[PDB]
Design a protein around this nucleic acid. Structure first.
Ligand SMILES: [Zn+2]
Ligand SMILES: [Zn+2]
Lengths: 30, 1254, 395, 94, 46
RNA sequence: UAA
């Protein structure tokens, strides 16, 4: 009913002066 | 705030398939140009008849074929963008394509890729209809097919299929395997020409059988190694599977590897082959010098035809194809597993019918006939027009003939505005019907067949006869025996009619009993060309051939509409009641009244006509046959309902259901009985050139034209393609753009034979003609540049037209080099003849003062590398094929005859990288300006030699034409010549002074009266100037690596102020200014098919006083952009004091696009409308226009609230139903419908500024 | 007087002619006439990246006073190469002809690192006294910054937007600086013992550091808190760099004779761990082709790697590229010239291989037959290919 | 106007006052030299101020010899140089 | 151990009364005009 | 009038 279509809604990144603000918990080597 | 529209549709054919997608009665030919999927029915004689066309929102990367159970039709596998697959099926009920499923692989590909993905993914289909793989590079996405419709997909790197797979060159499905198996060609260590000495045989080949386990939630694929070959030549790039193995195509070798995985033999195609380097198996040395230097070699493999008892006839043929359109026959005489007599033979083309075609894209066999001797082949080409060829005797007497061609404007490498028509104000003693109009002229092709393509803004008719003051309001031409007698004219203002016998120079016949003292509403032949019927304002008269009155019928009220068929007359009067009379068969002179249904009189009829069609046959008694069209009395009611009935109607009236709302689909149904009339005139008639199909054309009171197509099967239904944006917008419903219908009433006239074309003429201030080619949908074209009041048939295959100034002209359709498809009439101008064959033409300019065209040819001569001195570089080889250099010159072309008037040649290695016709200030004190031709010549040489170039200043001078032929009165005079250090990649004029670019340098020079040229300014560019444009004293210079920069130019104290730079770094292709009112924006095309909008915003906070250009939006195009130009913009309603401009760009795929800047409120309206259309309407292949246009590397840095609008999405608003249109419009704005229609008209007519000039 | 010139203008003319006409980039054949079909380095991706290898020694350069060269840096557009000397001078060298002489006398002590702004508008240079000067593209000294660090500056990297830059020194401290006023922002505290290298992520807000504590750390520029440590190197990590274009890969070299490339997208995943019998001295990512980088060793021996070709050995080794320890590498932004400086007080330029070359992979840079002025003819040759010699020698 | 050569010289851009303030620039390169502005006296010598429609020549362009460092893009003095920062061939130092 | 003024245009050299040119010892100073010009350009509008 |  909503018609098949490729989704497209990317999340905007904050992008302050130091760069893009990202989740820093993805950098632990584990 | 900009909107993107396609001026021209793509013409380069990139893919082709033969299948049964929309029907099983015949094998259709699917053609993909760039984003348009056209279904063709190939005839026996090779003609291509279009059945249905579809336009997609994204670049169609590849197409695949897959069948489905319990259906003869095959689902279409559509690949678009980067790693996207949409399964398409054809809905025969709705006559449209509906998406079955969507598969997205870009995210997984990015997650599994160490480096950035390739721009184009490659699709491969198993010849067992069980699986399909899509690989970008080293990453393969598998799409299993169940034998619900698709199993879950799995994405994996090539390394986990085979351990050694490290750099995939090609992947192909192998044939004659029980299980789906693939062949991988890869190079674990990358090797090129400069790497071969220290790396021998790097290419590896592995055969893996894929065991697919489709589970409910995921899919597991297990691969078993069938064979592995490790020593292969470095230049192998293409795998061509065959019945018993695979042919590996390289630049220098042709390797055959059987399904068991042994190198049986190779063929050394040229002197660069790995001679004695492999030395493992059979070697077939060849001195034919065949080079497959392309990345992927196009080929067709035809399986062996079955014999009478079921054999093979041993006729399995494989044909290769060079970039130069050389067809090669490769034979495989294998008696089994072993193969003998492996060789390649070049097919001889005696008549060189492939001379004008290069860079083939696809080959498809049209008709099989169960024989590999004869072959009909459709081949799409990147430069020439796509050809349908017939191959008769494939032997190791062979002959090839051309059956039909699909017009291709090839790569549009240049764009300019000039005077192709209206060079002379007076033609045949009368003003030019398309006077003071300009048209786009582009350069097309990449070689011998390169030509000039005139993108005509309007159809230019051929005038063979011109009259003055022969008409006032309307004309009619009678044909006693097809002899053009009795050109009756009428004068509505003074109620006068005249005869003007047209046998002899339109003399007054002065005889007969014709009512001269009354306004003639309609007069035509009647009763099988034995009677003449004339309907005046309040009377009906029946005459004979000699105008002797026989019957007179008096009408109480004045008549309005009247239509004639051979036995019947239909007359409508002011009250709205309908009167139909039937002529007496025996002795005429009666005109018996025809009984009408009593339901008809109680409802109001706006217009009516007598019609012949078979659409209502299935609802009539004793009629279930396709042919034998019935006579239908069609009428239009006040509620926009189309009704009709037969002569023996009893009391049943039928109706085209759904036409009041202008739905996508209409069907015939019984009619059972709000006065808001919009439909003004309808008529159902055949259109086309040789394949004439029935079409329902509707003329609305607002001036816009709607067309429906009757399907050859299930003829009681009419369909309109809403996805295809083929029908031009000519008006607006709710009295918007009333100036298009206010002056001259719009009347549609049908002509079954214009020049063999069944066309529809629409009168008005801006006339329109509807022309349908056999291979294209009907198109509405602007007809001339003067108003058309009345049009009547003339002689055989001609019409007579009368304008608003009482001038009569006889017109014929020009069909010699013209293609009446692709949204605009295209004129092919062949500059190269059989005598002097100039190669690819480029950098076309127009000299306004002399009214001439200048183009630069570019011949590809062999390149001889030389050092700083005149010494050949060490590693040369004379007895080997060499790489191609360049050799260019300037051609002076007179548009009057389209012949080269003056030609000058530049030395070896020279390429004219930029030529411009510019107004140069030759005196600063007096501000005198002269139009000079400036050509930027770059010496295209190797990297290791110092870069050099030259610039030439040319003045077009008027000389005495040499006796013998006219139009040779102009010659090129070289004002100034200078060789400079550094390649001259661009030429641009700024404030009467011209700026050229050296190597990493740009210089501004000024010319004085004494023809002295001296540099005055100086600026340093980062890497390499790709394009440069000037707006007054402001300049933009594009860089091959760092975007572009904004530069202001000052005089007296000459300065080059660095106003700003683009923060985004991209390899720009073309530049142009997008002013949009007080502000300033720039349009930059990227090498990644992206066009960027950037603005100069010194007042913005984080712009460093404007030094950082603000990135506004990025818009992904469907092909690379070769050229951009600034064009004045036409305003229909609001004409501000400041001028307006638009950007026009030519694409490599043969398409032309324009960017139209918009104001704030217009942008808001169109943006909300586009969002509503995208979110609520059904996209064709499931493609998201936002994903197609904005999913690029610059999405994050742009303004997410102000993207570039795609006019292709907006035009779907015009194609919606009336109620749907209102619902979409009201979502933002109380008067949003009216203003939205107004600015849609403004965008559509934005390029009509070419219609008025000087 | 004609001389060797390496200009990419004509290849760009050919490339844009091919692109604007829809023609493909034709495969180059092993013959000199096919050199015209060698496209500029920015045009090669995928399997064509092998063409971008700077395997050909094209020029040897040196200054009038032979000083140690601690750092070299190409101009942001690649027009010139800036050579810093141990005496605190700047040597400029035009890329087209490898010719320039005039010095600058930039710093009072040995210049240890230079870095250009992403917008090509500024350069920041440190020295041995902890002094961080700021330069305009015309080399105008606009900001002094005296006591930037107590010890010698080691590395400096600009933020993506260029308003901030991080500096590290022999002192075990990293300082974030606001470029607008030159003021010192928060201090990145940690890193026992000296910190040798630092880098800013090309787009993300992230700092990668290398120190003597055998650690590579990730920092939050906004907060200054260390967010991740790499406990893999067994000795001092000398250099660490992000991939300049996308930044998905972080590579660092250690005195433990091991080079490690980390995929920052997936939990610091170990991609490549190559080891050599000689110490790795400095590294350099390819500016155009990802997955390709060059390692410089203590015995010369330039080593070029490819993530997509070999994860254990270099795809090309130039065993005798320099006569002594190589101190600094610098790829041209255009990607067609590779510049290397070593302790032998010489700057050597490298270009892409030719379709045919008698002396290919036989130059005295590939075999140690460096007799007298073996580079005299290589530097004085007008052409590039040259005829076969004994090894590629000269007088 | 002319479709071949559209008139883009005198266009009402709204950043014209900014271009007059910074760079002392305008969209008319051949504007007359102001008779009030004096390079030595400074920007305060013009009654119309920096937004003067005429031309205010900076003192850098009053120099007699073209700067050799500016030609190479290596002039450390910028607008304060005593040599001409203009591509004037007749004023070149031989 | 003591440097010599090589590229400095002597406009940014001040007599210290470190680095010398001809007998007299000087020191390199900033380009105050350029840095303050940059700060002025960072402000909004002009 | 120079670095
Ligand atoms: Zn003034
Ligand atoms: Zn100067």
């Amino acid at each position: 009913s909503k018609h098949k279509m490729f989704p497209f809604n990317p999340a905007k990144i904050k992008k302050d002066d130091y760069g893009t603000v990202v989740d820093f918990t993805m950098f632990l080597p584990d | 705030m900009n909107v993107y529209d396609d001026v021209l549709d793509a013409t380069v054919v990139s893919h082709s398939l033969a299948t049964h997608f929309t029907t099983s009665d015949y094998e259709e030919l699917l053609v993909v140009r760039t984003n348009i999927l056209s279904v063709y029915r190939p005839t026996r004689d090779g003609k291509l008849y279009l059945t249905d066309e579809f336009k997609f929102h994204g670049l169609i990367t590849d197409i695949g074929l897959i069948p489905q159970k319990d259906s003869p039709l095959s689902c279409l596998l559509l690949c678009t963008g980067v790693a996207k697959i949409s399964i398409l099926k054809f809905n025969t009920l709705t006559n449209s394509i509906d998406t079955l499923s969507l598969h997205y692989y870009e995210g997984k590909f990015k997650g599994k890729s160490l480096v950035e993905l390739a721009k184009i993914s490659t699709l491969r289909m198993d010849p067992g209809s069980s699986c399909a793989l899509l690989f970008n590079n080293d990453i393969i996405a598998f799409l299993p097919f169940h034998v619900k419709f698709t199993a879950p997909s799995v994405v994996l790197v090539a390394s986990e299929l085979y351990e050694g797979a490290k750099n995939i060159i090609d992947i192909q499905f192998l044939k004659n395997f029980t299980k789906p198996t693939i062949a991988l060609l890869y190079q674990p260590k990358l090797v090129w020409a400069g790497n071969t000495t220290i790396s021998k045989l790097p290419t590896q080949y592995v055969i893996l059988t894929l065991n697919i386990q489709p589970a409910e939630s995921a899919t597991k694929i297990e691969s078993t190694t069938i064979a592995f070959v490790k020593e292969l030549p470095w230049d192998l790039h293409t795998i061509v599977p065959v019945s018993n193995g695979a042919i590996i195509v390289g630049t220098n070798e042709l390797a055959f590897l059987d399904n068991t995985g042994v190198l049986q033999s190779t063929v050394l195609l040229n002197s660069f082959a790995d001679k004695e380097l492999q030395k493992t198996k059979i070697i077939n040395n060849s001195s034919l010098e065949i080079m497959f230097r392309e990345k992927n070699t196009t080929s067709i493999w035809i399986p062996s035809s079955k014999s009478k008892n079921g054999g093979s006839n041993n006729d399995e043929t494989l044909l290769l194809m060079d970039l130069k359109s050389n067809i090669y026959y490769i034979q495989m005489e294998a008696e089994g597993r072993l193969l003998i007599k492996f060789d390649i033979f070049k097919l001889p083309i005696v008549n060189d019918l492939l001379k004008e075609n290069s860079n083939p894209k696809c080959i498809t066999r049209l008709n099989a006939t169960n024989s590999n001797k004869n072959m009909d082949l459709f081949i799409g080409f990147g430069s020439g027009n796509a050809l349908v060829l017939r191959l008769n005797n494939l032997k190791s007497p062979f002959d090839i003939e051309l059956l039909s061609s699909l017009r291709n404007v090839g790569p549009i490498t240049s764009l300019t505005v000039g005077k192709v028509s209206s060079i002379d104000d007076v033609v045949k003693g009368l003003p030019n019907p398309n006077k003071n109009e300009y048209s786009l002229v582009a350069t097309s092709g990449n070689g011998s067949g390169s030509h000039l393509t005139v993108i005509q803004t309007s159809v230019q008719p051929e005038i063979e006869l011109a009259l003055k003051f022969i008409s006032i309001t309307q004309i009619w031409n009678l044909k006693i025996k097809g002899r053009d007698r009795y050109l009756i004219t009428t004068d509505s203002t003074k109620s006068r009619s005249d005869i003007y016998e047209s046998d002899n120079n339109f003399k007054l016949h002065k005889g007969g009993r014709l009512r001269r003292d009354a306004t003639t509403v309609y007069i035509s032949m009647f009763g099988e060309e034995k009677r003449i019927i004339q309907v005046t304002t309040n009377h009906l008269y029946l005459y004979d051939t000699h105008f002797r009155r026989l019957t007179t019928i008096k009408f109480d009220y004045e008549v309005i509409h009247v239509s004639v068929m051979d036995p019947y007359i239909l007359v409508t009067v002011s009250r709205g009641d309908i009167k139909i009379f039937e002529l007496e068969e025996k002795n005429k002179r009666k005109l018996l009244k025809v009984d009408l249904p009593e339901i008809l009189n109680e409802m109001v009829i706006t217009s009516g006509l007598i019609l012949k069609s078979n659409m209502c046959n299935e609802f009539l008694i004793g009629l279930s046959k396709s042919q034998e069209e019935q006579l239908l009395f069609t009428f239009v009611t006040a509620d926009n309902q189309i009704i009709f009935f037969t002569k023996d109607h009893n009391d049943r009236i039928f109706q085209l259901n759904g036409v009041d709302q202008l739905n996508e689909s209409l069907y015939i149904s019984t009619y059972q009985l709000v006065p808001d009339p919009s439909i003004k005139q309808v008529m159902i008639n055949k259109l086309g050139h040789d394949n004439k199909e029935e079409y329902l054309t509707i003329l609305t009171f607002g001036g816009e034209i709607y067309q429906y197509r009757k399907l050859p099967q299930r003829r009681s239904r009419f369909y309109r393609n809403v996805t295809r944006n083929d029908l031009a917008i000519t008006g607006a419903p709710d009295n918007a753009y009333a100036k298009g219908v206010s002056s001259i009433e719009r009347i549609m006239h049908y002509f079954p034979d214009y020049n063999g074309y069944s066309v529809i003429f629409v009168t008005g201030s801006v006339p329109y003609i509807l022309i349908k080619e056999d291979d294209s949908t009907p198109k509405i074209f602007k007809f001339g540049n003067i108003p058309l009041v009345s049009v009547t048939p003339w002689s055989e295959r001609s019409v007579m037209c009368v304008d608003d100034i009482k001038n009569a002209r006889v017109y014929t359709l020009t069909t010699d080099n013209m293609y009446y498809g692709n949204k605009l009439p295209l004129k092919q101008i062949k500059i190269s003849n059989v005598l002097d064959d100039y190669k690819t033409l480029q950098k076309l300019v127009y000299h306004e003062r002399a009214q001439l065209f200048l183009v630069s040819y570019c011949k590809r001569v062999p390149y001889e590398a030389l050092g700083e001195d005149g010494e050949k570089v060490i590693g040369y080889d004379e007895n080997v094929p060499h790489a191609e250099g360049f050799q260019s010159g300037i051609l002076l072309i007179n548009p009057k005859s389209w012949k080269v008037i003056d030609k000058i040649d530049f030395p070896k290695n020279s390429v004219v990288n930029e030529m411009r016709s510019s107004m140069i200030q030759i005196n600063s004190k007096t501000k005198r300006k002269r139009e000079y031709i400036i050509a930027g010549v770059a010496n295209a040489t190797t990297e290791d030699t110092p870069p050099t170039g030259a610039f030439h200043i040319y003045d077009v001078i008027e000389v005495v034409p040499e006796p013998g032929k006219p139009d040779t009165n102009y010659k090129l005079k070289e004002i100034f010549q200078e060789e400079v250090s550094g390649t001259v990649s661009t030429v641009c004029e700024v404030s009467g002074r011209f700026m050229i670019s050296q190597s990493q340098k740009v210089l501004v020079r000024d010319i004085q009266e004494d023809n002295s040229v001296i540099p005055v300014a100086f600026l340093d560019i980062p890497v390499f100037v790709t394009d440069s444009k000037s707006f007054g004293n402001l300049l933009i210079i594009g860089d091959a690596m760092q975007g572009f920069q904004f530069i202001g130019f000052d005089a007296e104290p000459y300065r080059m102020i660095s106003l700003g730079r683009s923060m985004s770094k991209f390899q720009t292709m073309s530049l142009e200014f997008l002013v949009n009112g007080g502000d300033m924006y720039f349009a930059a095309t990227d090498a990644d098919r992206n066009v960027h909008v950037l603005k100069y915003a010194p007042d913005e906070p984080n712009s460093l006083s404007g030094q950082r250009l603000v990135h506004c939006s990025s818009f992904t195009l469907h092909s690379t952009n070769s050229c951009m130009m600034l064009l004045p913009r036409n305003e229909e309603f609001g004409s501000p004091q400041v001028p307006s401009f638009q950007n026009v760009g030519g694409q490599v795929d043969g398409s032309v696009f324009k960017i139209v800047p918009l104001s704030e409120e217009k942008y808001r309206r169109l943006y909300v409308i586009q969002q509503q259309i995208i979110d609520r309407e059904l996209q064709l292949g499931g493609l998201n226009p936002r994903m197609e246009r904005l999913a690029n590397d610059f999405y994050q840095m742009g303004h997410s609230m102000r993207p570039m609008l795609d006019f292709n999405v907006i035009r779907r608003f015009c194609g919606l139903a009336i109620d749907r249109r209102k619902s979409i419009a009201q979502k933002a704005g109380r008067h949003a419908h009216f203003e939205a229609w107004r600015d849609i008209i403004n965008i559509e007519f934005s390029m009509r500024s070419l219609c008025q000039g000087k | 007087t004609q001389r060797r010139s390496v200009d990419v203008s004509s290849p760009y003319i050919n490339l844009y002619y091919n692109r604007r006409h829809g023609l493909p980039n034709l495969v180059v054949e092993p013959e000199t006439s096919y050199t015209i079909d060698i496209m500029p380095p920015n045009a090669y991706r995928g399997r064509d990246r092998v063409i971008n290898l700077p395997s050909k020694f094209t020029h040897l350069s040196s200054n009038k006073v032979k000083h140690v060269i601690p750092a070299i840096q190409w101009t942001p557009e690649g027009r010139r190469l800036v050579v810093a000397t141990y005496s605190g001078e700047f040597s400029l060298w035009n890329a087209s002809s490898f010719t320039f002489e005039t010095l600058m006398q930039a710093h009072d002590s040995a210049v240890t690192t230079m870095k250009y702004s992403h917008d090509s508008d500024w350069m920041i240079s440190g020295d041995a006294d902890g002094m961080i000067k700021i330069w305009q593209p015309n080399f105008s000294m606009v900001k002094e910054i005296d006591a930037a660090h107590t010890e010698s500056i080691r590395d400096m990297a600009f933020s993506s937007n260029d308003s901030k830059f991080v500096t590290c020194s022999d002192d075990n401290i990293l300082k974030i600086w606001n470029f607008s006023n030159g003021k010192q922002e928060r201090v990145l505290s940690g890193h026992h013992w000296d910190v040798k290298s630092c880098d800013w992520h090309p787009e993300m807000g992230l700092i990668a550091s290398a120190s003597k504590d055998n650690l590579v750390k990730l920092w939050d520029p906004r907060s200054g808190n260390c967010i991740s440590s790499i406990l893999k190197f067994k000795h001092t990590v000398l250099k660490t760099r992000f991939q300049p274009t996308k930044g998905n890969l972080l590579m660092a070299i250690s005195k433990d004779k091991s080079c490690r490339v980390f995929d920052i997208r997936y939990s610091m995943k170990e991609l490549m761990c190559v080891r050599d019998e000689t110490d790795y001295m400095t590294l350099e990512w390819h500016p155009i082709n990802e997955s390709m980088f060059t390692l410089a060793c203590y015995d010369g021996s330039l080593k070029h790697f490819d993530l997509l070709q070999n994860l254990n050995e270099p795809i090309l080794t130039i065993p005798y590229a320099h006569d002594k320890c190589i101190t600094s590498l610098s790829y041209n932004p255009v990607g067609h010239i590779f510049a290397t400086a070593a302790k032998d007080r010489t700057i050597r330029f490298w270009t892409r291989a030719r379709p045919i070359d008698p002396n290919a992979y036989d130059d005295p840079t590939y075999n140690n037959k460096k007799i007298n002025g073996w580079f005299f003819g290589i530097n004085n040759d007008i052409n590039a290919v040259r005829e076969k010699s004994e090894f590629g020698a000269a007088p | 106007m002319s479709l071949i050569h559209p008139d883009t010289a005198k266009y009402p851009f709204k950043f014209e006052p900014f271009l007059r303030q910074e760079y002392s620039f305008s969209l008319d390169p051949d504007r007359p030299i102001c008779e009030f502005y004096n390079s030595r006296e400074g920007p305060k010598s013009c009654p119309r101020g920096p937004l003067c429609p005429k031309k205010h020549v900076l003192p850098i362009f009053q120099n007699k010899i073209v700067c050799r460092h500016w030609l190479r893009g290596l002039c450390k003095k910028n607008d304060q140089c005593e040599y001409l920062h203009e591509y004037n061939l007749r004023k070149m130092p031989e | 151990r003591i440097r010599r003024t090589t590229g400095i245009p002597k406009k940014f050299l001040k007599s210290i009364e470190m680095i010398t040119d001809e007998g007299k010892f000087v020191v390199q100073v900033e380009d105050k005009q350029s840095w303050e010009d940059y700060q002025r350009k960072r402000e909004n509008r002009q």
